[PDB]
Amino acid sequence: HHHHSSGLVPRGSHMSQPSILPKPVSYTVGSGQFVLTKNASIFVAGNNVGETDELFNIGQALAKKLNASTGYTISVVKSNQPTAGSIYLTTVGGNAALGNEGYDLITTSNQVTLTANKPEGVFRGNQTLLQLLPAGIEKNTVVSGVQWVIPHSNISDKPEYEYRGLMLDVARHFFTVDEVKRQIDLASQYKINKFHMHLSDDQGWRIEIKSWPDLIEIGSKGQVGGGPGGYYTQEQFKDIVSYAAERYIEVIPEIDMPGHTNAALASYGELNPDGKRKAMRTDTAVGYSTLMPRAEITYQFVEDVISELAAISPSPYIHLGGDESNATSAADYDYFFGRVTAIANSYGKKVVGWDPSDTSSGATSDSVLQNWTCSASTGTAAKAKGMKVIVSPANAYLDMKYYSDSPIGLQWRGFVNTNRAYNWDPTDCIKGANIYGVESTLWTETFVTQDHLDYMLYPKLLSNAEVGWTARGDRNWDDFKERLIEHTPRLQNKGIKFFADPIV
Numbered sequence: 346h347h348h349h350s351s352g353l354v355p356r357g358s359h360m361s362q363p364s365i366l367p368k369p370v371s372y373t374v375g376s377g378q379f380v381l382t383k384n385a386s387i388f389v390a391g392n393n394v395g396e397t398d399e400l401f402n403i404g405q406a407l408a409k410k411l412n413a414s415t416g417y418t419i420s421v422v423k424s425n426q427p428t429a430g431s432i433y434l435t436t437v438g439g440n441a442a443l444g445n446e447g448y449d450l451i452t453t454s455n456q457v458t459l460t461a462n463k464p465e466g467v468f469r470g471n472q473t474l475l476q477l478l479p480a481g482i483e484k485n486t487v488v489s490g491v492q493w494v495i496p497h498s499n500i501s502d503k504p505e506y507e508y509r510g511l512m513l514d515v516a517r518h519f520f521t522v523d524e525v526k527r528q529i530d531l532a533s534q535y536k537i538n539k540f541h542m543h544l545s546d547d548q549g550w551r552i553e554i555k556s557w558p559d560l561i562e563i564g565s566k567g568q569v570g571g572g573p574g575g576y577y578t579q580e581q582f583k584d585i586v587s588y589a590a591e592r593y594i595e596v597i598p599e600i601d602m603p604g605h606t607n608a609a610l611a612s613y614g615e616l617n618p619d620g621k622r623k624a625m626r627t628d629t630a631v632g633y634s635t636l637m638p639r640a641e642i643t644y645q646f647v648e649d650v651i652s653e654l655a656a657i658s659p660s661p662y663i664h665l666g667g668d669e670s671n672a673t674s675a676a677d678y679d680y681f682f683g684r685v686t687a688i689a690n691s692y693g694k695k696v697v698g699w700d701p702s703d704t705s706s707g708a709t710s711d712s713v714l715q716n717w718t719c720s721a722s723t724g725t726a727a728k729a730k731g732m733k734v735i736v737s738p739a740n741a742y743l744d745m746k747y748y749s750d751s752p753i754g755l756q757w758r759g760f761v762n763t764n765r766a767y768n769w770d771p772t773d774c775i776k777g778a779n780i781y782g783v784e785s786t787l788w789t790e791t792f793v794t795q796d797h798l799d800y801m802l803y804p805k806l807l808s809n810a811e812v813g814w815t816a817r818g819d820r821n822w823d824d825f826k827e828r829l830i831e832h833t834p835r836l837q838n839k840g841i842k843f844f845a846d847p848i849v
């Protein structure tokens with residue numbers, strides 16, 4: 346048999362007919378079709394009144410999306426007797442084998458029926474439902490001239506990995522609450538279920554800490570290149586968390602330590618050995634900053650920050666960073682990370698950290714490793730300790746240029762086009778581990794606008810999202826590439842300023 350790899354498409358990028366992404370476990374089509382009309386209602390039914398109430402909220406979110414493009418006013422009804430032309434969302438009789446996030450989605454001529462184990466699974470299944478309707482449905486304004494049809498079809502689905510995440514760096518360049526909400530919303534449509542916020546680094550501190558007000562008053566006032574920066578009040582952070590929660594997305598906040606701490610060091614002189622504030626940094630260098638690993642003031646500061654953040658962040662996890670502590674000795678790093686893990690645990694939070702934080706003697710088997718280095722020795726400690734691992738290889742570093750000539754992005758991991766972002770497996774990063782899942786990381790050294798985010802995340806994130814959801818045995822670039830071409834109008838309709846990658 347003959348085989349080949351993909352080259353660029355001759356003559357440039359290519360960028361009734363559903364386009365489901367990520368690819369579901371099974372999808373069959375039969376004869377006939379369902380028509381969504383102005384008379385349609387969404388019926389919801391759970392196993393008890395409380396579950397029906399949660400399903401009702403999910404139905405209302407769906408109705409809002411459908412109403413925006415159809416111009417209809419679909420309403421939501423608490424009843425297990427759907428009428429002809431209805432969409433029906435239920436958890437009664439879910440197939441337990443599909444887990445919390447799995448669902449069956451069956452479309453007949455008279456009815457759309459989504460059956461799941463949990464409300465979460467009906468939410469994920471609704472992302473598929475939106476992809477079965479014609480392109481146009483994802484418009485934010487009324488579309489005329491399109492019959493709103495769904496083919497007679499049968500889908501069953503569930504994720505391969507539990508953790509399917511996106512990290513946004515808001516320290517290097519700041520993005521508004523609206524901009525952040527929009528990226529969460531877009532990611533949710535591709536079944537991303539985790540959002541990691543890199544809230545602090547050398548060039549800025551982005552979270553209000555009432556006990557240390559100069560973190561904002563001084564530490565938030567810049568960014569890479571010297572723009573004005575910005576920050577989130579605690580109320581704005583809670584608002585983001587609440588918005589994510591409506592999409593069944595866990596928000597994991599990161600306060601990076603003991604390295605990548607210049608902004609804190611520029612806010613409070615007492616955090617530095619000579620008692621003087623550091624100058625703010627607007628360059629892109631890394632590795633040079635450190636908290637004082639043997640000063641009690643350091644641990645007081647960390648405990649105050651953790652206390653306030655834990656109070657407003659319901660996730661059982663806090664990310665304490667731990668990357669590129671090149672101004673911290675190995676002995677001091679071991680000690681520091683063990684101490685801050687104890688502080689986090691005392692506030693009821695488990696710790697996530699970049700490699701090499703798993704090597705800390707103070708880590709527990711409840712700690713999580715985010716393995717970005719993905720070398721043979723990375724996560725040896727994590728594996729021995731029974732720690733879950735989130736993988737972020739080169740292929741998930743979405744801030745990398747697509748090509749040598751990309752107008753934005755970095756290239757210290759090489760270039761990452763849409764193909765590279767697809768053609769990998771979590772076991773390529775680390776073998777013999779408990780892989781919790783995957784996280785796409787969007788660092789923002791070179792991204793200043795919403796259009797820059799869109800351009801780098803789309804279509805790259807779609808590739809990573811399929812790697813997280815779809816089983817390896819069912820992943821194939823030639824398949825995905827053709828499905829992506831078909832999906833392109835939907836990206837356009839959503840207002841995403843995506844890159845038309847010539848490999849697609």
Ligand SMILES: CC1=N[C@@H]2[C@@H](O)[C@H](O)[C@@H](CO)O[C@@H]2S1
Pocket residue numbers: 605631668669699717742744755788789790
């Ligand atoms: C972990 C990591 N720490 C660094 C980040 O601070 C940079 O922003 C990123 C840019 O790609 O490179 C490595 S990844």
